[PDB]
Amino acid sequence: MDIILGIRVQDSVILASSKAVTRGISVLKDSDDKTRQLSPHTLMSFAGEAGDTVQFAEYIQANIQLYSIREDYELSPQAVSSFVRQELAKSIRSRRPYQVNVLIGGYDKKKNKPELYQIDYLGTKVELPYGAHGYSGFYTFSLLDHHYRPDMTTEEGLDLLKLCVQELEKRMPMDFKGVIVKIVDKDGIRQVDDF
Amino acid sequence: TSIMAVTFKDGVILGADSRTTTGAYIANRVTDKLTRVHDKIWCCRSGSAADTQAIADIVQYHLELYTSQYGTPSTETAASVFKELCYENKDNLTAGIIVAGYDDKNKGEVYTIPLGGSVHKLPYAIAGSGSTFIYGYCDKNFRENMSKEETVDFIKHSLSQAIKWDGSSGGVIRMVVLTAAGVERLIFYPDEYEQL
Amino acid sequence: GYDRHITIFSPEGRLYQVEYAFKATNQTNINSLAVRGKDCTVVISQKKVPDKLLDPTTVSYIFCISRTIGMVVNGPIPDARNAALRAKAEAAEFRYKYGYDMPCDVLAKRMANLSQIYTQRAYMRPLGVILTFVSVDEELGPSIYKTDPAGYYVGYKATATGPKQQEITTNLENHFKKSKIDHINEESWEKVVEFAITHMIDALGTEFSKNDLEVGVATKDKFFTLSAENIEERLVAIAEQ
Amino acid sequence: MTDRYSFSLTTFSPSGKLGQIDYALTAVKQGVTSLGIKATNGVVIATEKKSSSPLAMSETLSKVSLLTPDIGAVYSGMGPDYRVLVDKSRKVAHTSYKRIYGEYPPTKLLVSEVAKIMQEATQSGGVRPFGVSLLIAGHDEFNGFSLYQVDPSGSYFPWKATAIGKGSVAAKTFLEKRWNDELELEDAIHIALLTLKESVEGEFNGDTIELAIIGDENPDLLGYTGIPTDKGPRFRKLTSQEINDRLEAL
Amino acid sequence: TQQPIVTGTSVISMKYDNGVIIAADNLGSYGSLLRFNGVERLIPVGDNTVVGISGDISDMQHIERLLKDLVTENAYDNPLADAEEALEPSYIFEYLATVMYQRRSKMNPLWNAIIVAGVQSNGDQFLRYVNLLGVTYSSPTLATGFGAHMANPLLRKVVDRESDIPKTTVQVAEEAIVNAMRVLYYRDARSSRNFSLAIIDKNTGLTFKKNLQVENMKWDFA
Amino acid sequence: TGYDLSNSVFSPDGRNFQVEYAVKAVENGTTSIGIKCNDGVVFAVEKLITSKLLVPQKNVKIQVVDRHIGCVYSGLIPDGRHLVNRGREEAASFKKLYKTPIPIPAFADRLGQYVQAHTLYNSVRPFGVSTIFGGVDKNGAHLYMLEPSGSYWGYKGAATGKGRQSAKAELEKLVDHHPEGLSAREAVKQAAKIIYLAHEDNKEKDFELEISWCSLSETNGLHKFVKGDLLQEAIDFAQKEIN
Amino acid sequence: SDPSSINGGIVVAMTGKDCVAIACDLRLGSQSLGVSNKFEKIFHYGHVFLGITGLATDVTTLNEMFRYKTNLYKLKEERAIEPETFTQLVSSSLYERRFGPYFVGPVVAGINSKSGKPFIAGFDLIGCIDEAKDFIVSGTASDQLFGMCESLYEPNLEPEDLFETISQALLNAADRDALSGWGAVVYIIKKDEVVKRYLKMRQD
Amino acid sequence: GSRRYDSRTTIFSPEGRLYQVEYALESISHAGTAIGIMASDGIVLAAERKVTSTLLEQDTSTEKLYKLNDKIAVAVAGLTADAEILINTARIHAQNYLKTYNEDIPVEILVRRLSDIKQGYTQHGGLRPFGVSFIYAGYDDRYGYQLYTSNPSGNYTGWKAISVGANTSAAQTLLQMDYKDDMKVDDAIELALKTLSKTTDSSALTYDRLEFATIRKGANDGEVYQKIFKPQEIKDILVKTGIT
Amino acid sequence: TTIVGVKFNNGVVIAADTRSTQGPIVADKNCAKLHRISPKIWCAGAGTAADTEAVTQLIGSNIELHSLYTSREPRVVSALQMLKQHLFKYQGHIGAYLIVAGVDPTGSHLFSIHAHGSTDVGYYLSLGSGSLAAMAVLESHWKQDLTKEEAIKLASDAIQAGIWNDLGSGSNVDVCVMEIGKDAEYLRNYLTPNVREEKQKSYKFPRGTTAVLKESIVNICD
Ligand SMILES: [Cl-]
Ligand SMILES: [Mg+2]
Ligand SMILES: [Mg+2]
Ligand SMILES: [Mg+2]
Ligand SMILES: [Mg+2]
């Protein structure tokens, strides 16, 4: 785990997530996908405690997919984010809490608007034009404060994201083995293969 | 605290000081540490005020329910109920209790129950922080089959010394006399006992 | 007709199991009576020991519930003792929880509430007993409160219970019409016991030896029962007047 | 051992009736008459004190009961069932309201809680329904004065005036002729006493009649002074003497 | 999890040709305060067993009640309660051993060291140890606390192995026990002069001696 | 009707027919008695020898509770054992909390309340035994008899089973002829006589006598079975009286 | 790892002449890192306003909880909850979690629609009601707010004047606290109109 | 034991019907008629009070029409006490959904859950079913205006117009006759009142024996308003259509 | 906090200060520490503020229900018994320290309760951080057979000692007088010796001083 970023532009939400899985003094994998598709137009990235992350992600995925089948309908990004927040808000006062931080990127088809939600393990939710979890934010937030405009295209958003990854690869202590980038828009979720 | 109970010819007498403590501040200088659990079965309380009170309240309830069904309980029975509470809840209690009562068959009887919850039947018993200072005096001066006046003087002199040396003890000396005649409450003020 | 086996309503809005429990009340064929003095409350009950092999001292329907409260039962002894043990336990718990002696009327209400539950809940049968509670309450003074299998309860100036209850009731009514007061205007409890026995003799029309009666007396701070010789002393006093 | 009766004792018959509820209402019909009248500035509830024996002290048996300082209750039907309902009603006003909001529940909601308790005795395992109808009179700041009837089924209805029990049919007709929307509290007490005399047979005085009002705040009955917002209970039980005073100008 | 309050010190014992001897002083200590002097720490069960207990006295009194109850329970529906189906020393031990190990396994021990001494129905000597941990062992001589360090060496000079048991008389054995008790009074800061001693013989039965004193002491040599 | 099909149901009389039916099971059982004496109590029971194959002295029916109380019963034997098992639990918890052994009147109410509880619900059956029991406590000797309804009283003498009326008549004579009191050793002999006299009501199968006693002087206040020389002496006394 | 000072934030309430004001900052951070500058801390249920400072997850949770409870209240009672009653509901709900509390500092503000009286109140994390004629303060700059309010406040201020006083109380308090600021919102509340104003403040 | 007194409320008849459900429906057929009509720009709820007395307080009364949330209401036919148990459950369920998802509950989801509770009482627990039939009237942004009905079996269905309680057979025929799809709210108000007036067991339909409610988008721009009619407003709407 | 209770001729009086603190900061300058359990039974509470309020309300609620159940005026010993058993159950984790006083059919009463569950009795008592300042005054000026007006003077003087000398206590003096046969008389702000002096300057700002980015009307209606 470690690096997960998100940028909301004019027509889409872009999520970038590090590929490395490190345990001790060994990078066990360099192609790890730290994301789950919750619904056709909603994607969730995650970072935190080993085991907890995937277990929580897949548990949420199962619940949203269950909802989709029951109602023959896709929950709004706002509704999914509220469901996830409440699960983490319950979790924090459990015997053993889920130590997982998430970003939720979705395209609301009823509003025709991209939406990005940042939720931490305590259940602290905020809607943002750009987001980050962990130490990443200490570099990317100020960078995006400067270069981000609300009316940018998806291509402009990807260039803005390249600028973030470059900065992290320069100043971060650990080798996070690059990122997997995914775009969420009106046509659903797709992966950029050459980043 | 300094507390004691002493058997004699006509029955048994209980004794106690009146000082309650929170650190070095005297929260109550006129405390009543001698408590009725039955008509002629009383106890001396030492240790935590809250723990000993909660125990004595439960015992009084048990003996009231015993009396309703089986008549007057023996002093031994009362001590057994105290023991059961003290022994089974030894991890969560700080209570040193002396039980004393008058039967007509058994006359005066004294049972002491220390921290662990063990029971010890004795001719007389001393307890509380101030008791340490009078082990020597009490062992040398106690006789069996004393008179009422002699036993009152024995307790008065003993607790006087315990009060003199123990900072956790003081105030008045309260006593409770248990005989066939009934229940008598005695009080003795500093101006009398200090100059013994 | 299973509406007569458990405590559910019949078409006419009645509870037959409750009604039949009232009939169990008289199964012992014993009459009881309670009156109030200035300082005391006296309760008397017949004592019938038919078998010669019985230990007469163990045959009793009067119970010492607490130091201040006494209770006489009209009904079979198993249910009577069931009610007594519960009452004793309830009175003991009340004192522990609330820091003062349970009043006679409050214990009466509590036992009446328990009885009410058996009239509503199916798995529990009603007890076939009528409970008469007596005391000298520290607030209300001399008190008589009575409970039945329906869960009903009320205070009394005086009362009677048993097969020949109505005769005793009217006898007492006629006395209080005459005296114009709510109690027996007498100083000592001894003469209030004498009044109680005298008026039971007149109403029932029978003479009593020392072993035919059972007497309970409530004064301030204690309820106690009388011995055979205490009753004999009382019987002699009535005869010599 | 243990309650093996985990099944309903009240069930639908082929015709659609719920037998036990119907039979409970029959028990209410047998019960002594009680009534309630709503005035512009208060509410009156009344009933006859049917004595079981002249040796019995009828003062010790209270048919009209205080639930909250501004709410009172009276009934027709089975006394023991009423007594435990009052106990439960008094408690639920605290547990499900006063301990949450720091104030007493409005009449309609306390009534709703009593109704719930009575509904559950109609559906839960191993119990019969309650054999009583309640009349609950009360006041609260935002609804003013109100009067409600609660039946064994758990149903409740708000009334301007009504009666329940033995002679309810005649008593309701009497109240229809006399009730208007301009009645003052003293006028409603007068009508209550008139209506009750029709159903009472024997003695008719302050010792055989039980009557309470929901009216003005009573600072003298509060028991303390110093808090301006606390002004005293609106519930007041009329004394034996106070009833007899009104029976002369009857 | 506990801590002991009122405590009892060493319990010592040994086998001889016809039976077993066991002893323990009459003191109930409260830390350094020698608080209670009339405490009996040897408890007979029937006429063929004596259980000696050291450690926490409140827990000792609990074990007393358990053994008392065991005698009652064994007599129930048992016509041979005073004959073939009487409580054997081996039964009494295994019961206590079970309880001790169960309590340690629930992290709430009975804070004691226990020696069960007796004679079996076939005449065999029984002597076995069990403590708060549930640890059990048997030996010709057994002792707890200080006794383990000071009494055992002395008692092992009389009976060093199994073959020494037939060669040891009750007079010789009691002499060694009484001597060991004196040594403990010299050297254990929580011993008293007063003690009890019990002999369980296969011929003469249970002899329980109370109010014994340590005597013939050497001090005159400072 | 149908009022007798379910336990705890009141009939229109105010009776619990299921309890009265349990009494019939008791009346069907063998005879058992209890005699109160100067400083104690004596219990005896009839044991029907169904076959030669029954081992003598080895099917014991009298039961001890605690160390000072004896219990004997007639009717469904297993039901009696259940009651004694409860009695032993009740006596143990009393002694645990209060230290002193349970007094006889106290013990009597413990059994009484427990048996009475089995008349309160339709999900349990009443006890098919009448139980004669007693012993010695701080206030002297006490004898009790407990019935399926939960009803119990103190007795000078008590009897139950198939030969109860024969035994009751014989008990009443002893009460009349000995107003000052009967001794423990005498009461053992009398108990043998009464069981032999009550055996006339069950005389197809011959029987085995079983006696027990508690006495302040003779047994030191503890329950003991009468065996050997004292039993044979009591048997001989009984044999001499029937002829 | 002190739950009440991880996210930061402040709330203040004041009374005026026939009016009340309640104000809050917009910051949400993770210790030193500022994350959001849009995180409002004042909510309303009918005409009753509630501000909540402290751990942000609990701020969100309690809002959702009191919306839940006031919605059921209105359905059953058939009227909007009043400030005095809502204050009691907040107290009860917090004390229900006595030995596992929400790490919050709530503030109630509003005008009783029957009496017309302005009402404010404050609570500790465990439910203790703090009623005040003048002002209630809460959050990581509570010391600063206490000082600003105690000196700037006077009774019976007009709505337009009260706005200036409460705004200046919040702004100058926030600027002396590292974890508060990043924007501000003020609510001016009259008997039947409510005006919401966003303040221009320094963004560091 | 207690087997003797068990009615066995949750069993099948030889024909494969549920006795208690069938008998509960028979009970509901005697309750006052309630009608729901769905128009393109709103929904009407109309219900007849059970034989009224002149001394009944009419304004502070609620018997037939209940509010579940701001977007959903129900008309009741059956035991009122039973209905209030279910209404409180439904009210809580709506708040749970809002708390979880921060969106008002879709109508069908609320209807399904309430119906699922009814179903449970027919399959397990040995208790009598709820003697209640609901008409649900509500709005959400997925399907817009919706009418549903549920009954003691726990079965629910959707409708353009529907009646429950007494005289449903006659009422349904009349609704089937005059209803058309392009209908407006004010037309539906008239149809509802006209149908009750013809199916009523009373002599004449008056204001004091009716409860009335509308759910329109007739607020200001893209939002829904619930109007539970006051006594005087029912008196006026009854005159406006010329019934009185 | 400073709180006291004083018995007199025909009843009892309790008093308290009105300062509420969070650390060294004064949160409320006029909080009410005098609570009502029943009309004629009143409580003064120190310690954890929410605990004193919550425990006083819970027992006050249960006392009302008990009074209605028994048809009797509530007794002080009942409130005392219920409070003490509740506080003991929680082993001091509910930090309520109370002075309980009132009149009932039994007479007039004065008690104190500690968080762990002990109760005390007295003619004069004091609790809280200013209890030592108050007790010093009470020990100096108390006597047997006080009148009503003497007891109020003594009580408020004891509270004043705390106000001036204890930093935990301040502002005003609240009093409640419970006399036998009369209504309890609550005297809010019986004394106000700490009124804020006139400020030197008005800090009313010129309108327009605060910079604004956005305005908008908020919808509170449906
Ligand atoms: Cl109750
Ligand atoms: Mg000293
Ligand atoms: Mg029943
Ligand atoms: Mg700042
Ligand atoms: Mg900064």
CATH code for position D188: 3.60.20.10
Helix (H, G, I), strand (E, B) or coil at A187: coil
d(CA A100, CA A47): 6
In the reported structure, the alpha carbon of residue G142 is separated from the centroid of ligand 4 by a whole-number distance in angstroms of 13
Domain B1-196, CATH among 3.30.1370.100, 3.60.20.10, 3.10.200.10, 3.30.70.1150: 3.60.20.10
SS3 per-residue string spanning chain D:
CCCCCCCECCCECCCCCEHHHHHHHHHHHHCCCEEEEECCCCEEEEEECCCCCCCECCCCCCCCEEEECCEEEEEEECHHHHHHHHHHHHHHHHHHHHHHHCCCCCHHHHHHHHHHHHHHCCCCECECCCCEEEEEEEEECCCEEEEEEECCCCCEEEECEEEECCCHHHHHHHHHHHCCCCCCHHHHHHHHHHHHHHHCCCCCCCCCEEEEEECCCCHHHCCEECCCCCCCCCEEECCHHHHHHHHHCC
Pairwise CB contact (< 8 Å): G114 & D106: no
Pairwise CB contact (< 8 Å): A82 & H109: no
Residue G134: exposure state from Cβ atoms within 10 A (0-12, 13-18, ≥19): middle
Pairwise CB contact (< 8 Å): H5 & C123: no
Euclidean distance between the first and the last CA atom of chain E, given in angstroms as a whole number: 45
Helix (H, G, I), strand (E, B) or coil at B119: coil
CB of D91 less than 8 A from some CB of I: yes
d(CA D147, CA G57): 46
Pairwise CB contact (< 8 Å): D4 & H2: yes
d(CA C66, CA C102): 9
Crossing angle for the helix pair H80-101 and H107-123, to the nearest 10 degrees:
130
Q: Give the neighbours of chain I: at least 3 Cβ pairs within 8 Å.
A: B, C, D, G
In Å, what resolution does this model reach?
2.7
φ, ψ (nearest 5 deg) of residue F98? -105, -5
CB of I218 less than 8 A from some CB of G: yes
Segments making up each domain of chain I, as ranges? 1-222
CATH number of the domain within which A161 lies: 3.60.20.10
Residue with tokens 């303040």: G199
Residue with tokens 């194959």: F53
Measured between beta carbons, the chain G residues lying within 8 angstroms of I172 are: none
Report the DSSP pairing between strands A100-108 and A113-119: antiparallel
Counted residue by residue, chain D has a size of: 250
Q: Comparing C-alpha atoms, which of E121, E35, E72, E89 is closest to residue E198?
A: E89
**To probe the interface with B, which of E37, E53, E56, E61 has the most B CB atoms within 10 Å?**
E61
Residue with tokens 């662990």: B116
Residues β-bridged to residue F178? none
Helices marked H in chain H: 19-28, 80-101, 107-123, 168-178, 185-199, 231-240
Q: Which listed ligand is nearest to B193 at the C-alpha? A: 2
d(CA H211, CA H60): 12
Q: Comparing C-alpha atoms, which of E145, E96, E86, E87 is closest to residue E116?
A: E96
Domains of chain C, start order? 1-241 (3.60.20.10)
CA of G88: which chain D residue's CA is closest?
D101
Euclidean distance between the first and the last CA atom of chain G, given in angstroms as a whole number: 23
Helix (H, G, I), strand (E, B) or coil at C82: helix
Residue with tokens 């309260």: B174
Superfamily of I1-222 according to CATH: Aminohydrolase, N-terminal nucleophile (Ntn) domain (3.60.20.10)
Measured between beta carbons, the chain D residues lying within 8 angstroms of G92 are: 99-102
CA of F125: which chain H residue's CA is closest?
H1
In the reported structure, the alpha carbon of residue G204 is separated from the centroid of ligand 5 by a whole-number distance in angstroms of 4
φ, ψ (nearest 5 deg) of residue H119? -55, -45
Report the DSSP pairing between strands A13-18 and A21-23: unpaired
d(CA B42, CA B51): 17
d(CA C24, CA I157): 69
d(CA C235, CA C198): 9
Counted residue by residue, chain I has a size of: 222
Residue with tokens 């301030």: C220
Classify domain E1-222 by CATH number: 3.60.20.10
Q: Do chains A and F touch (3 or more CB pairs under 8 A)?
A: no
Q: Do chains D and C touch (3 or more CB pairs under 8 A)?
A: yes
Pairwise CB contact (< 8 Å): E5 & B114: yes
In the reported structure, the alpha carbon of residue I26 is separated from the centroid of ligand 4 by a whole-number distance in angstroms of 23
3-state helix, strand, coil in chain C (%, to 5): 40, 20, 35
CA of A70: which chain H residue's CA is closest?
H109
In the reported structure, the alpha carbon of residue C114 is separated from the centroid of ligand 1 by a whole-number distance in angstroms of 7
Active site residue B22: no
Token couple for F186: 């005498």
Pairwise CB contact (< 8 Å): C122 & D130: no
Q: Are D80 and C116 in contact (CB under 8 A)?
A: yes
d(CA D140, CA D111): 13
Q: Which listed ligand is nearest to I70 at the C-alpha? A: 1
CA of I126: which chain B residue's CA is closest?
B27
Distances from the Cα of D80 to the Cα of A186, C80, C121, G39, angstroms: 69, 21, 13, 58
Counted residue by residue, chain G has a size of: 204
**Chain F contacts in chain D segment 143-172 (CB below 8 A):** none
How many domains would you assign to chain D?
Answer: 1
CA of D1: which chain F residue's CA is closest?
F123
Select the residue of H91, H99, H102 nearest G75 (Cβ to Cβ): H91
Pairwise CB contact (< 8 Å): H4 & F123: no
φ, ψ (nearest 5 deg) of residue F47? -115, 105
Give the contacts of C93 (CB within 8 A, at least 6 positions apart).
B61
Select the residue of A73, A82, A110 nearest H100 (Cβ to Cβ): A82
Q: Comparing C-alpha atoms, which of A97, A66, A89, A179 is closest to residue A132?
A: A179
User: How far does D126 lie from chain F, in Å, by closest CA?
Assistant: 13
> Which candidate in I1, I2, I18, I56 is catalytic?
I1
CA angle I143, I147, I149 (to 5 degrees): 115
Domains of chain H, start order? 1-244 (3.60.20.10)
d(CA D160, CA F220): 82
Report the DSSP pairing between strands I184-191 and D224-225: parallel
In the reported structure, the alpha carbon of residue E110 is separated from the centroid of ligand 3 by a whole-number distance in angstroms of 48
Token couple for E7: 């405590």
CB of H2 less than 8 A from some CB of C: yes
Segments making up each domain of chain B, as ranges? 1-196
Classify domain F1-243 by CATH number: 3.60.20.10
Segments making up each domain of chain E, as ranges? 1-222
Type of residue found at C37? G
CB of F149 less than 8 A from some CB of C: yes
Pairwise CB contact (< 8 Å): I72 & C109: no
Counted residue by residue, chain H has a size of: 244
d(CA E199, CA D79): 75
Q: How many helices and strands in chain G, by DSSP H and E?
A: 4, 12
Domain containing A154: what range? 1-195
Euclidean distance between the first and the last CA atom of chain D, given in angstroms as a whole number: 60
Q: Comparing C-alpha atoms, which of A115, A164, A163 is closest to residue A135?
A: A164
In the reported structure, the alpha carbon of residue H197 is separated from the centroid of ligand 1 by a whole-number distance in angstroms of 52
Type of residue found at A26? S
Pairwise CB contact (< 8 Å): E65 & F64: no
Buried/exposed code over F30-60 (b: 16+ C-beta within 10 A; e: otherwise): bbbbbbbbbbbbbbbbbbbeeeeeeeeeeee
Select the residue of E1, E6, E33 nearest B118 (Cβ to Cβ): E6
> Which candidate in B1, B7, B52, B112 is catalytic?
B1
Buried/exposed code over F161-191 (b: 16+ C-beta within 10 A; e: otherwise): bbbbebbbebbeebeeebeeebbbbbbbbbb
CB of D4 less than 8 A from some CB of C: yes
Tell me yes or no: is domain G1-204 CATH 3.60.20.10: yes
d(CA B105, CA B118): 25
Ion ligand 5 residue ranges (Cβ < 5 Å): G 204
Q: Are E76 and F88 in contact (CB under 8 A)?
A: yes
In the reported structure, the alpha carbon of residue I95 is separated from the centroid of ligand 2 by a whole-number distance in angstroms of 30
Helices marked H in chain A: 52-71, 77-91, 137-147, 154-171
Q: Comparing C-alpha atoms, which of H243, H228, H236, H237 is closest to residue H73?
A: H228
Q: Are I6 and I138 in contact (CB under 8 A)?
A: yes
Residues of F engaging B, defined by a Cβ cutoff of 8 Å:
96-100, 103, 105-106, 109
Ion ligand 1 residue ranges (Cβ < 5 Å): C 113
Pairwise CB contact (< 8 Å): D2 & F124: no
Pairwise CB contact (< 8 Å): I185 & D226: yes
CB of I183 less than 8 A from some CB of D: yes
